Design a protein around this motif. Structure first.
Motif, PDB file in Angstrom:
ATOM      1  N   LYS A  78       0.834  -1.196   0.000  1.00 33.06           N
ATOM      2  CA  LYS A  78       0.000   0.000   0.000  1.00 33.06           C
ATOM      3  C   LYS A  78       0.867   1.244   0.000  1.00 33.06           C
ATOM      4  O   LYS A  78       0.647   2.169  -0.781  1.00 33.06           O
ATOM      5  N   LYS A  79       1.837   1.262   0.907  1.00 28.12           N
ATOM      6  CA  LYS A  79       2.750   2.378   1.058  1.00 28.12           C
ATOM      7  C   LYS A  79       3.567   2.666  -0.187  1.00 28.12           C
ATOM      8  O   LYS A  79       3.707   3.826  -0.576  1.00 28.12           O
ATOM      9  N   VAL A  80       4.087   1.619  -0.824  1.00 24.67           N
ATOM     10  CA  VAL A  80       4.898   1.767  -2.037  1.00 24.67           C
ATOM     11  C   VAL A  80       4.001   2.304  -3.151  1.00 24.67           C
ATOM     12  O   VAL A  80       4.366   3.229  -3.885  1.00 24.67           O
ATOM     13  N   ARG A  81       2.824   1.696  -3.269  1.00 24.57           N
ATOM     14  CA  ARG A  81       1.818   2.069  -4.247  1.00 24.57           C
ATOM     15  C   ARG A  81       1.447   3.531  -4.013  1.00 24.57           C
ATOM     16  O   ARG A  81       1.230   4.306  -4.952  1.00 24.57           O
ATOM     17  N   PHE A  82       1.367   3.892  -2.741  1.00 27.85           N
ATOM     18  CA  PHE A  82       1.039   5.245  -2.346  1.00 27.85           C
ATOM     19  C   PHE A  82       2.045   6.217  -2.945  1.00 27.85           C
ATOM     20  O   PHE A  82       1.666   7.258  -3.477  1.00 27.85           O
ATOM     21  N   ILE A  83       3.319   5.851  -2.896  1.00 30.27           N
ATOM     22  CA  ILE A  83       4.377   6.701  -3.421  1.00 30.27           C
ATOM     23  C   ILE A  83       4.159   7.049  -4.894  1.00 30.27           C
ATOM     24  O   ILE A  83       3.897   8.209  -5.221  1.00 30.27           O
ATOM     25  N   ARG A  84       4.238   6.049  -5.775  1.00 30.67           N
ATOM     26  CA  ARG A  84       4.048   6.295  -7.209  1.00 30.67           C
ATOM     27  C   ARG A  84       2.741   7.033  -7.506  1.00 30.67           C
ATOM     28  O   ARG A  84       2.622   7.711  -8.529  1.00 30.67           O
ATOM     29  N   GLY A  85       1.783   6.925  -6.588  1.00 31.01           N
ATOM     30  CA  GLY A  85       0.520   7.616  -6.752  1.00 31.01           C
ATOM     31  C   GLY A  85       0.733   9.108  -6.563  1.00 31.01           C
ATOM     32  O   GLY A  85       0.589   9.902  -7.495  1.00 31.01           O
ATOM     33  N   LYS A  86       1.096   9.480  -5.340  1.00 32.16           N
ATOM     34  CA  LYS A  86       1.344  10.873  -4.990  1.00 32.16           C
ATOM     35  C   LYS A  86       2.358  11.547  -5.911  1.00 32.16           C
ATOM     36  O   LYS A  86       2.276  12.755  -6.152  1.00 32.16           O
ATOM     37  N   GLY A  87       3.255  10.747  -6.482  1.00 37.89           N
ATOM     38  CA  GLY A  87       4.300  11.278  -7.338  1.00 37.89           C
ATOM     39  C   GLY A  87       4.072  11.380  -8.832  1.00 37.89           C
ATOM     40  O   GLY A  87       4.779  12.130  -9.506  1.00 37.89           O
ATOM     41  N   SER A  88       3.106  10.642  -9.368  1.00 35.78           N
ATOM     42  CA  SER A  88       2.857  10.690 -10.806  1.00 35.78           C
ATOM     43  C   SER A  88       1.862  11.761 -11.221  1.00 35.78           C
ATOM     44  O   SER A  88       0.644  11.601 -11.086  1.00 35.78           O
ATOM     45  N   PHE A  89       2.405  12.857 -11.736  1.00 32.08           N
ATOM     46  CA  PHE A  89       1.600  13.984 -12.180  1.00 32.08           C
ATOM     47  C   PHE A  89       2.440  14.852 -13.096  1.00 32.08           C
ATOM     48  O   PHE A  89       3.636  14.998 -12.869  1.00 32.08           O
ATOM     49  N   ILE A  90       1.833  15.415 -14.133  1.00 30.39           N
ATOM     50  CA  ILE A  90       2.587  16.290 -15.016  1.00 30.39           C
ATOM     51  C   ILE A  90       1.978  17.671 -14.950  1.00 30.39           C
ATOM     52  O   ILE A  90       0.763  17.825 -14.776  1.00 30.39           O
ATOM     53  N   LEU A  91       2.843  18.671 -15.033  1.00 29.21           N
ATOM     54  CA  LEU A  91       2.414  20.053 -14.965  1.00 29.21           C
ATOM     55  C   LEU A  91       2.078  20.599 -16.340  1.00 29.21           C
ATOM     56  O   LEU A  91       2.672  20.199 -17.349  1.00 29.21           O
ATOM     57  N   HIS A  92       1.086  21.480 -16.372  1.00 26.51           N
ATOM     58  CA  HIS A  92       0.622  22.079 -17.607  1.00 26.51           C
ATOM     59  C   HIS A  92      -0.134  23.360 -17.296  1.00 26.51           C
ATOM     60  O   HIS A  92      -0.937  23.399 -16.364  1.00 26.51           O
ATOM     61  N   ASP A  93       0.110  24.392 -18.100  1.00 19.62           N
ATOM     62  CA  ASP A  93      -0.530  25.700 -17.950  1.00 19.62           C
ATOM     63  C   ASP A  93      -0.391  26.209 -16.521  1.00 19.62           C
ATOM     64  O   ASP A  93      -1.364  26.334 -15.768  1.00 19.62           O
ATOM     65  N   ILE A  94       0.852  26.469 -16.154  1.00 12.40           N
ATOM     66  CA  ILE A  94       1.188  26.953 -14.831  1.00 12.40           C
ATOM     67  C   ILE A  94       0.863  28.435 -14.683  1.00 12.40           C
ATOM     68  O   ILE A  94       0.650  29.130 -15.677  1.00 12.40           O
ATOM     69  N   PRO A  95       0.697  28.905 -13.437  1.00 10.18           N
ATOM     70  CA  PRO A  95       0.400  30.318 -13.188  1.00 10.18           C
ATOM     71  C   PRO A  95       1.649  31.222 -13.285  1.00 10.18           C
ATOM     72  O   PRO A  95       2.415  31.366 -12.324  1.00 10.18           O
ATOM     73  N   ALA A  96       1.875  31.786 -14.470  1.00 12.20           N
ATOM     74  CA  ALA A  96       3.007  32.673 -14.674  1.00 12.20           C
ATOM     75  C   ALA A  96       2.598  34.071 -14.237  1.00 12.20           C
ATOM     76  O   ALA A  96       1.413  34.366 -14.052  1.00 12.20           O
ATOM     77  N   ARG A  97       3.598  34.912 -14.016  1.00 15.97           N
ATOM     78  CA  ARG A  97       3.389  36.302 -13.628  1.00 15.97           C
ATOM     79  C   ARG A  97       4.425  37.127 -14.388  1.00 15.97           C
ATOM     80  O   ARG A  97       5.446  36.596 -14.833  1.00 15.97           O
ATOM     81  N   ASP A  98       4.170  38.419 -14.544  1.00 14.92           N
ATOM     82  CA  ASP A  98       5.141  39.252 -15.227  1.00 14.92           C
ATOM     83  C   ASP A  98       5.784  40.285 -14.331  1.00 14.92           C
ATOM     84  O   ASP A  98       5.107  41.005 -13.595  1.00 14.92           O
ATOM     85  N   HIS A  99       7.111  40.308 -14.363  1.00 14.32           N
ATOM     86  CA  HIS A  99       7.886  41.215 -13.539  1.00 14.32           C
ATOM     87  C   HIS A  99       9.154  41.637 -14.252  1.00 14.32           C
ATOM     88  O   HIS A  99      10.051  40.826 -14.487  1.00 14.32           O
ATOM     89  N   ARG A 100       9.226  42.928 -14.557  1.00  9.67           N
ATOM     90  CA  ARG A 100      10.368  43.517 -15.239  1.00  9.67           C
ATOM     91  C   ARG A 100      10.766  42.725 -16.479  1.00  9.67           C
ATOM     92  O   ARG A 100      11.946  42.419 -16.690  1.00  9.67           O
ATOM     93  N   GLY A 101       9.762  42.386 -17.287  1.00 10.78           N
ATOM     94  CA  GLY A 101       9.987  41.629 -18.507  1.00 10.78           C
ATOM     95  C   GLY A 101      10.524  40.217 -18.325  1.00 10.78           C
ATOM     96  O   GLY A 101      11.298  39.720 -19.152  1.00 10.78           O
ATOM     97  N   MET A 102      10.121  39.571 -17.236  1.00  6.88           N
ATOM     98  CA  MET A 102      10.547  38.207 -16.954  1.00  6.88           C
ATOM     99  C   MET A 102       9.385  37.367 -16.459  1.00  6.88           C
ATOM    100  O   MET A 102       8.492  37.866 -15.761  1.00  6.88           O
ATOM    101  N   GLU A 103       9.378  36.099 -16.859  1.00  2.80           N
ATOM    102  CA  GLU A 103       8.318  35.197 -16.451  1.00  2.80           C
ATOM    103  C   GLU A 103       8.643  34.640 -15.072  1.00  2.80           C
ATOM    104  O   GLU A 103       9.633  33.944 -14.881  1.00  2.80           O
TER     105      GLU A 103
END
Lengths: 45, 845, 100, 100, 50
Positions: free
Chosen positions: B76-101
């Motif tokens: 359960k615990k091992v399975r728990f790990i790969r669970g909590k850990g498998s995710f990909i990021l997409h369309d993150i919250p960017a902000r603009d500051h002095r012409g930098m993301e």
């Protein structure tokens, strides 16, 4: 709970036929031996 | 013309449903890996690892004498790990500051909020800088653009995110391409048109693919399964087997040849006979299937009934059989017994001679067929049964086991072209059954006349076409159609015949299909034109891969579980091998087991056979696979699982601090914990076994002993069992259960006169953090009491969970790289695309 | 008789495995020591731990090995120490086929 | 999980009437005991259990809804010849369970 | 056993009998093989188990 009774593969898991116990067989045993004798003595001279 | 395969198939359905199991999660923000708890002070606060809090309560309590439980708790615990850990990021919250993301605070693992309201103007501003200081790097990876930033994350978990991402990367270049192309080959070889439509999109240019299965598979894993032989065969046919029809020849062929002279009656008075279906046809299906396997399923003994007499039926079948089946030196079709009876039925048909005699030169061996039939004397010794040679029966002086090297699978890409029929093209059959020799068939026709009947051998000349088409058809089916990871490997294919000869037995077992004596004739007057292929074909390969990967995942699990015993003996003393995999089987997919059980409920597997299988290096990688494999890795620390060997008891005072400068309590509010920075000096510890405690209590010395040890400041530590770790926080003086909770139980019961005792060691252990909260009305004195307050339990884990932090020290944790796909780009798993294709039809007549 | 020596040897060699705690006992060893130590304590009435640490725990274990070693050699050292005393019965533990 | 503390209360004077290691012979000295003894052995030690049948898949296996293998012993579908013979089987088991 | 090793419902094999009329003297098999082994000696137990 079940030490060696652990059934790993289906190959051992079959159907149930009958079942016996200590007091069950102990009686049966005697019975059989007693029938034996009557059936012979009562049967022959 | 309507046979299927139930109960072994309703499984194929849920295996198809396995492809749907989405093992990853797509988010725009990672889960918080770091929480901040606010003591009363603007200077310093404490950070928490969350992960550990969650890992705290994952599995059941770790009780000794319950190995099965233990294993699952871990799983359960091992399975728990790969669970909590498998995710990909997409369309993150960017902000603009002095012409930098810049990254929006919510996208990094961590919570400030709590803190924000307290911190001084200066501190606040400082942090603000660090925030607009966290910039986003651009471009790169997998030809398409991705955003990179440095956010924080918990050790074990981050490892999974990483591996996951790496897999996606591979897919993006290498792995996708492979899988697709493999299909194109398989669609060529098996005549299946495959949908490319999914990538034909248009927005394709910027679409990230998430194929989570991989296609080349790997024949090994499938056959590495112990005793799989039969189950795999069943699979092959359940998958790869077409539904067809048995065509009859021209009614005229017999009428002109055999049934020509009306007043002959011969052995072929049999011709009139129609078919007793129920028994007969199923017997023809058997003969066909078995022969189209070919050496896997034999055309065994031919049943027994007293109809075995009927000389017409018998003789007829004797001839038919020498052309219908292969005793071939390359591979076998029939039983040794089945053949002998055939040779005899044939022997009698020959020296039957109802008409004008020939010349019958009997041989030295009384053995049937030791006679050369005159004129030219074609000694029928060549029509005997020599399996190792092929000599009489079909094939014989022909090549059927050939090898067109490149072909899908690598399941030794051989090809059975019955009687030299290198059938690679669309058949007619109005044409193709022309000038086609068989040699065995050809020599049959010579012997057929040199010996006797022309009328009977003429029916055989006229039959050649129809006979050549039944076979050409078969080849396409065997060779082209049933070419899957379920059709048997070659080194075994080649071993069937010789092992059969040898009599000696190994795993690779021939199937026993008992046949009707009369069905032989009916089969010779029934060719096979497959009306329509099984619906599983196009989807099959996907399903194949599903099974394959699932298997390896199990192996892996077991590889780690096995060593758990030598690893933690004090916990699994009662552990026996059966235990650990019963737990694996338990937590693994039922459909997979089902497939195995096909031959396991039949053949029997020993723990030893299982270990071998586990240890076999051959794994078909999938997303699931790599992740589990990596989870297991991170999961080797065990402190990382939240269960430690280090639990002691020692007379300890509860810190009662002075309060002169109340303002100075902007300190870490003297948090205090059981958590030992490091364990005790071994020469100061007293190791207790139940065994010793028994003895001591047996002398009414137990309590006394403990007291003295405690009074000596020395530490004691019961057992050596793992014990689950719990974590709690307190605002004030905790319950006596936590403070003075003893890691053992000792009771005395008087029965009869005797008096018995019971001693149990705890399994649960609580680590706590008691934050000291104070106020202005407090006196420096207030916190001190004449007599101390004691705490006995102390634990140790060299894993920084909760720790004193500054403020500017918060952002510190950012040490972890992160990859996030642009919101304007599309992501999509096309794992399901592998079932999109079409069974390419037959030309029909 | 040789068996007796083999036992007493095994026991000692096993005790040597107990270096300084940080050890995960070889499953096999545990079993042996346990059986021995058990039987020994049942005849010595002394408190021998399977995993000593204190010192007095260690002494007891050593003393055991000593008692066994002497018994296996057939030696009677007599009153040589105030802290240790030789139990002649040590031989009976070593003669019991129950210890491997 | 319990243990026997050899703690004797100052109130209790124990009265044991039978010692445990029983002399094998006294039982087997009784003339014509054999049978009686045997039965006793059964009635006391013989546990409770069930007879299991093998897997139907061990003999016949399905390849197609239409194609199935047949075990050379189709006669093995005979429903037990009453207890008249079922008991007759119990004899067999019980017989080998008690050597000669 | 004898009666049935001798009952051939399929093609018959070479049964080379022994001089003794005692059951299981023959040697059925295209490779011979004694059936005399499965006789019944109580001092050996040559036929049945162990």
């Amino acid at each position: 709970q079940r030490p060696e009774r652990i059934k790993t593969t289906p190959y051992l898991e079959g159907d149930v036929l009958s079942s016996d116990s200590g007091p069950l067989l102990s009686v049966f045993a005697l019975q059989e031996i007693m029938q034996k004798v009557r059936q012979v003595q009562a049967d022959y001279m | 013309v309507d046979f299927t395969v139930p109960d072994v198939q309703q499984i194929l359905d849920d295996i198809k449903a396995l492809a749907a199991e989405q093992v990853y999660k797509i988010v725009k923000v990672p889960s918080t890996s770091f929480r901040h708890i606010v003591t009363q002070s603007r200077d310093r606060v404490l950070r928490v690892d969350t992960y550990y809090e969650e890992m705290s309560q994952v599995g059941d309590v770790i009780t000794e004498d319950e190995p099965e439980k233990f294993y699952s708790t871990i799983i359960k615990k091992v399975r728990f790990i790969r669970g909590k850990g498998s995710f990909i990021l997409h369309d993150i919250p960017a902000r603009d500051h002095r012409g930098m993301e810049v990254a929006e605070p919510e996208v990094l693992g961590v919570e400030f909020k709590n803190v924000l309201p307290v911190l001084t103007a200066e501190h606040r501003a400082m942090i603000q800088n660090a925030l607009d200081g966290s910039i986003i790097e651009n471009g790169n990876v997998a030809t398409r653009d991705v955003d990179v930033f440095i956010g924080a994350c918990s050790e074990p978990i981050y490892r999974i995110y990483n591996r996951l991402q790496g897999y996606i990367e591979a897919v993006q270049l290498q792995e996708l391409r492979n899988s697709i192309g493999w299909l194109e080959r398989l669609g060529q070889r098996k005549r299946i048109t495959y949908s490319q439509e999914v990538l034909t999109d248009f927005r394709r240019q910027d679409m990230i693919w998430v194929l989570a299965l991989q296609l080349p598979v790997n024949p090994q894993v499938v056959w590495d399964v112990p005793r799989s032989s039969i189950a795999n065969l069943i699979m092959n046919i359940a998958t790869c087997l077409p539904t067809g029809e048995y065509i009859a020849p021209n009614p005229r062929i017999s009428s002109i040849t055999l049934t020509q002279r009306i007043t002959t009656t011969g052995p072929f008075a049999i011709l009139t006979g129609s078919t007793p279906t129920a028994q007969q046809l199923n017997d023809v299906r058997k003969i066909y299937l078995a022969l189209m396997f070919p050496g896997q399923i034999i055309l065994d003994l031919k049943i027994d009934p007293g109809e075995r007499m009927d000389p017409a039926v018998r003789m007829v079948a004797g001839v038919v059989g020498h052309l219908l089946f292969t005793a071939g030196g390359r591979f076998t079709n029939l039983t040794q017994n089945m053949a002998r009876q055939l040779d005899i039925a044939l022997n009698d048909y020959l020296l039957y001679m109802y008409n004008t005699r020939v010349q019958v030169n009997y041989g030295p061996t009384g053995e049937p067929l030791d006679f050369q039939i005159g004129r030219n004397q074609y000694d029928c010794n060549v029509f005997r049964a020599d399996f190792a040679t092929g000599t009489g029966y079909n094939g014989w002086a022909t090549i059927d086991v050939e090898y067109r090297d490149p072909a899908p699978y690598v399941h030794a890409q051989r090809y059975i072209r019955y009687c030299g029929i290198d059938s690679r093209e669309l058949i007619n059959p109005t044409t193709y059954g022309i000038g086609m020799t068989y040699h065995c068939y050809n020599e049959m026709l010579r012997m057929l006349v040199a010996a006797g009947k022309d009328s009977e051998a003429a029916y055989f000349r006229s039959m050649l076409p129809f006979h050549m088409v039944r076979f050409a058809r078969i080849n396409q089916i065997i060779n082209e159609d049933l070419h899957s990871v379920f059709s048997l490997p070659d080194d075994m294919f080649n071993a069937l015949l010789p092992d059969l000869i040898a009599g000696a037995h190994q795993n690779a077992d021939p199937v026993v299909l008992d046949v009707s004596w009369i069905s032989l004739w009916f089969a010779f007057n029934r060719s096979f034109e497959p009306t329509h292929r099984n619906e599983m074909l196009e989807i099959a390969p996907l399903i194949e891969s599903v099974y394959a990967s699932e298997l390896s995942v199990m192996k892996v699990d077991m590889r780690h579980l096995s060593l758990m015993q030598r690893r933690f003996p004090d916990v699994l003393i009662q552990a026996r091998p059966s235990h650990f995999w019963k737990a694996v089987l338990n937590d693994s997919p039922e459909a997979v087991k089902a497939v195995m059980n096909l031959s396991h409920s039949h053949n029997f597997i020993n723990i030893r056979d299982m270990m071998r299988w586990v240890l076999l290096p051959s794994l078909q990688p999938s997303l699931k696979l790599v992740l589990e494999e990596e989870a297991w890795a991170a999961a080797n620390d065990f402190e990382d699982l939240m269960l430690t060997d280090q639990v002691y008891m020692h007379r300890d005072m509860l810190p009662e601090p002075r309060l002169d400068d109340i303002e100075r309590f902007r300190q870490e509010g003297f948090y205090y914990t059981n958590m030992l920075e490091a364990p005790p000096e071994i020469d100061r510890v007293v190791q207790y076994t139940y065994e010793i405690a028994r003895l001591q209590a047996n002398m009414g010395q137990f309590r006394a002993a403990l007291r003295r040890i405690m009074d000596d400041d020395d530490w004691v530590r019961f057992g050596g069992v793992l014990r689950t770790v719990r974590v709690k926080f307190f605002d004030a003086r905790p319950p006596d259960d936590i403070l003075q909770g003893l890691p053992f139980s000792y009771d005395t019961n008087e029965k009869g006169g005797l008096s018995y005792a019971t001693i149990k060691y705890a399994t649960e252990t609580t680590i706590f953090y008691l934050i000291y909260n104070v106020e202005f009305s407090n006196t420096p004195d207030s916190l001190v009491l004449i007599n101390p307050t004691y705490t006995m339990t102390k634990v140790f884990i060299n894993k920084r969970i909760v720790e004193r932090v500054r403020v500017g020290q918060i952002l510190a944790v950012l040490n972890r790289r992160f990859v996030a796909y642009k919101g304007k780009m599309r992501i999509m798993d096309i794992t399901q695309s592998l079932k999109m294709g079409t069974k390419l039809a037959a030309p029909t007549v | 008789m040789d068996t007796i020596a083999a036992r007493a040897l095994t026991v000692m060699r096993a005790c040597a495995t107990l270096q300084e705690a940080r050890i995960v006992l070889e499953a096999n060893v545990m079993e042996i020591l346990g059986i021995a130590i058990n039987r020994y304590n049942g005849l010595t009435l002394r408190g021998v731990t399977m995993r000593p640490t204190s010192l007095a725990q260690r002494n007891e274990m050593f003393f055991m090995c000593l008692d066994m070693m002497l018994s296996a050699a057939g030696i009677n050292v007599g009153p040589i120490s105030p802290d240790y005393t030789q139990h002649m019965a040590t031989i009976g533990v070593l003669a019991t086929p129950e210890i491997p």
